[model samples]
Target: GSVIVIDSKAAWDAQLAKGKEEHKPIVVDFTATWCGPCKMIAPLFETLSNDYAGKVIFLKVDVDAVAAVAEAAGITAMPTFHVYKDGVKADDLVGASQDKLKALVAKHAAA
Candidate 1:
């Protein structure tokens, strides 16, 4: 219902594929538990997921567990935020920018 955790290359691939096939809007949080910002802002993502409920796709990717997936996705930093629409990435937000995070959530949640 809320954030979906992806820990493997397979899960990552399938999720993205799902997004494309179903025309789903997804927000992926490329996060690591060691990062303070990831821990801090992570709850906001969960809350936003709850707000959108089943409508939006909230995927939490742990670079530690799935480095290949992160590398393939062009993740340059921890706690990066990627907003996807109908499968492909619509926008990617790096660092701990709060406003943009919420904006992207709101963005992909709508048509």
Candidate 2:
């Protein structure tokens, strides 16, 4: 499966609206190409996306490309993972701890 990439503000808005119908929490991975930690978590994010499939929307936002969103989210660093529901942030993961990342996912994951 492929991670949904939010590139434009329009796309973001569309997802926010679509997310309500899907009833799936959207996980937005705010990352940068140059961030080593972000690179390290790529496979894990992909795997989880596959594992969770319909339960959640695994999305990625390139901080460099979507600087507006990143700024709005108060992203001072790379690889900020934000979980959103109904267009509002439900949870967030910062830094690169796989354990912490998994915990966040588990907490929001659909049973």
Question: In model 2, where is the ten-residue run with the lowest total lDDT?
Answer: 102-111
Return the TM-score for each candidate structure: 0.90, 0.92
* Predictions in order: lDDT: 0.84, 0.84
Q: Candidate 2 overall Cα lDDT vs. reference? A: 0.84
Per-candidate clashes, comma-separated:
0, 0
In model 1, the worst 10-residue window by lDDT is: 83-92
* lDDT of each residue in 1-111, candidate 2, tens digit only: 668988987787788778777888888889999999999988999888898887888888898898887888889876789888988887887889888878788788843
**TM-score, predicted candidate 2 vs. hidden true structure:** 0.92
- Give the lDDT of residue 104 in candidate 1: 78
Model 2 off-target regions past 4 Å?
Answer: none
* Colliding pairs, model 1: none
RMSD of each: 1.4, 1.3
